[PDB]
Amino acid sequence: METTVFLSNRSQAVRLPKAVALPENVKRVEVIAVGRTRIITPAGETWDEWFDGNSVSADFMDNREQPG
Amino acid sequence: METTVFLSNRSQAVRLPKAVALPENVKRVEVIAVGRTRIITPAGETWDEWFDGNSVSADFMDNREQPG
Amino acid sequence: METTVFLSNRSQAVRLPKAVALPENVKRVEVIAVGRTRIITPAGETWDEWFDGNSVSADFMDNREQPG
Amino acid sequence: METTVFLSNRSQAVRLPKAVALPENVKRVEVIAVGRTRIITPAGETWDEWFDGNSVSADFMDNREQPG
Amino acid sequence: MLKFMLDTNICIFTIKNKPASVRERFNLNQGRMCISSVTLMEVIYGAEKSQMPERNLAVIEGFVSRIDVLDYDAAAATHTGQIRAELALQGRPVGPFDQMIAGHARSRGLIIVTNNTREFERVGGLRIEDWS
Amino acid sequence: MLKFMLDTNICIFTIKNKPASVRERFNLNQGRMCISSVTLMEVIYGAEKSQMPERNLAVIEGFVSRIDVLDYDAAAATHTGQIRAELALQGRPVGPFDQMIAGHARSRGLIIVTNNTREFERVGGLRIEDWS
Amino acid sequence: MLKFMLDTNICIFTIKNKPASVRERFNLNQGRMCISSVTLMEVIYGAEKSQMPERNLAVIEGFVSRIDVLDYDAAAATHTGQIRAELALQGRPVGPFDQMIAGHARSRGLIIVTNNTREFERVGGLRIEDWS
Amino acid sequence: MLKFMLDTNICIFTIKNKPASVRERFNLNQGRMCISSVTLMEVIYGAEKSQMPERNLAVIEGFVSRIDVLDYDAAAATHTGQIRAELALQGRPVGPFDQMIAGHARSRGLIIVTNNTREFERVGGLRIEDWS
């Protein structure tokens, strides 16, 4: 889908039409500029970050206690 | 650079920082939804991003293996 | 008896022959879509058809076998 | 979904709201009256009819000639 | 419009025994009733475990076509997750599927309709009605 | 808006070789291009048959996200069924998937875009373009 | 909902010989049965290939009017792509149209009903039944 | 599209031990992975059962934010119902939550990713993978 570009908050901005609309959970986004094209990727998706970030505690129940 | 997602005209829209501001000539752009990543491209240059990068590996069967 | 399907107000509607005409008191009815079969019932008597017929076989486990 | 009953072609008739709307292929319909409830079934669905109706000819290709 | 969530017990009770009392309540509260997918799989299991599946499935289909089947969303999962933990700290035993049905109701703010209140009674933040 | 149906051959040709000529045509005819599900499974097969599936799939995903994938409907099946029969009476050999792509186009009245016209040329009622 | 996807093989078998056993299976599982658009084109091809097309076509039409024809979607294509690759790696041969029918079923989690169980057994993640 | 449905087992395993092997599998198949809402409630339960709930909850939240949480639909329920019955007839024991996760996958044709292959192998029509 093609939208239109507008100007707001003293910055160039673009609308995400209903089809290409992001997951509503995505509130922060990183923009990568490759030539004339812009890459909009949800800020915080690299698994390497979570795999290297904060871990759980020892209390975290290993077995699921699945009733049965 | 990172940015914020806001709502305008009852849909999602993304502010682009001046650091990642598109050429003034570019008024019409084209957004492509590849997974969670949105590819904004100047209208008429939609395939430029895909043709430039996105290299396919050599084993990619160049024939078709259609039974016949 | 058999009948015809026509279109009114941009949707489907079905003429019912006088042989199968509902009681005049019945103004509001309720249509239920079970597969290709539509069950029109007088509003407030929606479950009457299901409760009357539609007998379940005896082997139908009357307990629940919920793990616990 | 609940619709409303109307009078047309000198007969009581009912609308099929968008949700319970029949397959558009279904043009002829048989109406069975069970008490105050009406059973609307597509005229011509009994497999026993087709299994006892006209059969194909000897020319009907048994094997599919599936290319391979 | 949805106000009541029919649990598995009250459902099977109705499908198997078709009680008159439940018919009136159903006919009266038509449109404000729903079930959870958890309830669905359970009634499907019953039909599929029988020697006449197709027959029993059809009965079930009639039942389901008149109500709404709500999908177990992340909200339901979250609420149930909390719920499960709460019962653990309290040492109250509730069956798994039942735990999920309770969470699903809380997520959507629905009234649990049952014949066995004592089961759902342990969970907090739940309004229950006995339609038996 | 859709006018052109991209066949499997012209697709694989583009994904593997990324020819410049095709880029301009694509950028120009953006919005009026579509592929058949038949074409899709074929390009999926290629990616899945490779030693780097995920990498190749992503390339494909970029391609597919910019066009529309039309679903092989009963209309396509009907047209292809006729088509297959016609070729048989004429003794013209066309590959299966290709037979279906041709039918899909006829059902929707689209222009077949190919690098091998000679293949689709045998089928009648088809407008073909060579974008190679 | 739908449970079974009838293969082309099982279809042609029933249309030509109208077997009593299959009638009972049909009458028993009526409404839970469907065919793929791939199957449709094949039996259409057969009728149009026959010496009395309109005659067999009419029979074909009656049959399809009584089941559901699902459209070969992108989901089906993807699964078929996987299946195609998998079968290749193992050197297991399955016919083109059958590969697609299998994908359509797997993508939806339907049980394949066919009389050629061995061909479809090669495909993984697929439940198969012989109603002949 | 999505290919893999991560089991609760494989999830807890990764969240606690953050294994390097799984990171590569995750980084390789990123975007083609999902969990069931059934899985969500279970890991939520675990965190809320823990001695530092908010701490583990935050970890849990990060994990789910990176995959897709599919809602347990009526399709999943039906398949689980079938699975439940099938397993019973054969006397094969599978846990409640696992039964539901399997149904969710089968209904969508997804590959189950788990570390307990034996439990899920009992279920038929399901493709399983061990990413541990």
Residue numbers in the entry:
A (entry chain D), D (entry chain D): 1 to 68
B (entry chain B), C (entry chain B): 1G, 2 to 68
E (entry chain A), F (entry chain A), G (entry chain C), H (entry chain C): 1 to 132
The paper states:
VapBC TA systems are the most common Type II TA system in bacteria, and consist of a VapB antitoxin and VapC PIN domain-containing toxin. The VapB antitoxin consists of two domains, an N-terminal promoter-binding domain and a C-terminal, intrinsically disordered region, which conceals and inhibits the active site of the VapC toxin in the VapBC complex. Like many Type II TA systems, vapBC expression is auto-regulated at the transcriptional level through direct binding of the higher-order TA complex to two operator sites (OS1 and OS2) in its promoter. The related vapBC locus on the chromosomally integrated Escherichia coli F plasmid is mutated in bacteria that are tolerant to beta-lactam antibiotics, before subsequently evolving resistance.
To investigate the structural consequences of the vapB tolerance mutations, we used X-ray crystallography to determine structures of several VapB variants in complex with VapC. In VapBC hetero-octamers, two distinct SpoVT/AbrB-type DNA-binding domains are formed through dimerization of the N-terminal domains of two molecules of VapB, in a “crossed fingers” configuration. Mutations that confer E. coli tolerance to antibiotics map to the N terminus of VapB (VapBT3N, VapBT3N+L7P, VapBV5E, VapBL7P, VapBA13P, VapBL16R, VapBV20G, and VapBT3N+A13P+L16R) in vapBC on the chromosomally integrated F plasmid. However, we noticed that the DNA-binding domain of VapB appears to be quite flexible and with low local resolution, which means that side chains are not visible in the regions containing the mutations. In conclusion, the potential tolerance mutations of VapB do not appear to affect the ability of VapBC to form the canonical hetero-octameric structure.
